[PDB]
């Protein structure tokens, strides 16, 4: 979580012990159930946990898409999320192949 | 009657778009979750409501039979879509809070 | 965007290869990738006829994604 | 055992099918089970819950 822009910006600056609310889902719960929202969220954290900078490249590619002043995650449409979940999905596999040096066609689907 | 006699949408193109109406209504009712508190959605046991698809009867009607149908068989309307509508909305259409009404229990079930 | 503004602007009124290789001049036939013919092109269509048939499939597939929902009924 | 009985019983599973055939509902994709898992789907039951992470 600390690898996100906003949350690091709050936790670095704050000089007092304090509580801060955020909404992790921005406004995703208009068009998305809590289930799939939590699912995408854990995917966006797992790709930020591992690669970091190269995941943040996947998020911040197009500057035309802008994070609002309220939200954390940049405001996409549904289809842009459907592709970005596939890229963020890809980093986990390419990185896994880099780490254990397993060409990834050698794995069973369950293993993926 | 084809109530649009003033346009050929081939020549003129489609002269209106009501797409936004559908979302704005959906948030006038309280969003998709509170809408689905009134349904059997949880009974089905699906996880997320996002990809639900209702069978479109437009498919197979042609090949039912031809000569054979009896008058009622051919002309009468099928009760099957209304039953689908009252299953999906059942827990509101059947609710105990009612102003005036009497309990019955079905024969072999525990359904009031 | 940029175009639009720099255009819809009163002030404006007052005032070719990716690798620098020579490029054609006149309008070329359209293409899948938008590549522009080399400065040396004679200007005659020479084609098997495929490149146009890919558009017909391209338009088709792109159309029946819309037609499928809109023609749906019940 | 109840977590595993809700998803097992042929009788229950025949309610869940028979309702669907009653409602005439289908879910697109079929990947869905390629996503997440059983005890995962537990959290979203309405009761109120929290998570805590002390790594930071």
């Amino acid at each position: 979580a600390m690898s996100i822009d906003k949350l690091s910006d709050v936790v670095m600056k704050a000089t007092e012990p304090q509580m801060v609310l955020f909404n992790i889902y921005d406004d995703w719960l208009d068009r998305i159930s809590s289930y799939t929202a939590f699912s995408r969220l854990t995917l966006l954290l797992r790709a930020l946990k591992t690669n970091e900078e190269s995941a943040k490249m996947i998020l911040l590619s197009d500057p035309t898409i802008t994070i609002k002043s309220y939200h954390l995650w940049p405001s996409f449409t549904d289809e842009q999320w459907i592709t970005i979940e596939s890229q963020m999905r890809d980093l986990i596999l390419t990185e896994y192949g880099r780490k254990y040096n397993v060409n990834i066609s050698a794995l069973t689907q369950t293993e993926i | 009657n084809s109530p649009f006699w003033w346009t050929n949408s081939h020549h003129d193109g489609k002269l209106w778009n009501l797409n936004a109406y559908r979302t704005d209504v959906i948030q006038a009712l309280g969003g998709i979750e509170t809408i689905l508190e009134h349904t059997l959605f949880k009974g089905t046991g699906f996880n997320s409501w996002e990809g639900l698809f209702w069978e479109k009867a437009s498919g197979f009607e042609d090949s039912m039979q031809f000569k054979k149908l009896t008058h009622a068989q051919r002309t009468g309307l099928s009760q099957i879509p209304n039953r689908r509508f009252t299953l999906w909305w059942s827990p509101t259409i059947n609710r105990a809070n009612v102003y005036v009404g009497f309990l019955v229990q079905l024969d072999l079930t525990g359904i009031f | 965007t940029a175009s639009s503004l720099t255009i819809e602007d009163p002030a404006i009124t007052f005032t070719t290869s990716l690798l620098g290789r020579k490029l054609y001049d006149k309008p070329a036939p359209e293409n899948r990738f938008a590549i522009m013919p080399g400065s040396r092109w004679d200007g005659v269509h020479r084609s098997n006829g495929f490149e146009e048939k890919w558009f017909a499939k391209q338009n088709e597939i792109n159309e029946k994604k819309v037609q499928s929902y809109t023609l749906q009924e019940d | 055992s109840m977590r595993t009985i809700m998803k097992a019983n042929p009788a229950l599973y025949v309610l869940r099918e028979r309702i669907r055939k009653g409602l005439q509902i289908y879910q697109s994709s079929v990947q869905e089970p390629f996503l997440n898992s059983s005890n995962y789907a537990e959290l979203f039951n309405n009761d109120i819950k929290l998570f805590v992470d002390d790594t930071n």
Binding site: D78, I82 | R22 | - | S29
Partner: peptide, 25 residues
């Protein structure tokens, strides 16, 4: 339009074994 992409998208995630094998090595 369908109210939800997820209907119109026809598919969600189909892993490509060819690109990953190139990207890994």
């Amino acid at each position: 339009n369908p109210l939800f992409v997820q209907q119109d998208i026809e598919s969600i995630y189909k892993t490509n074994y060819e690109k990953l094998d190139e990207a890994v090595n």
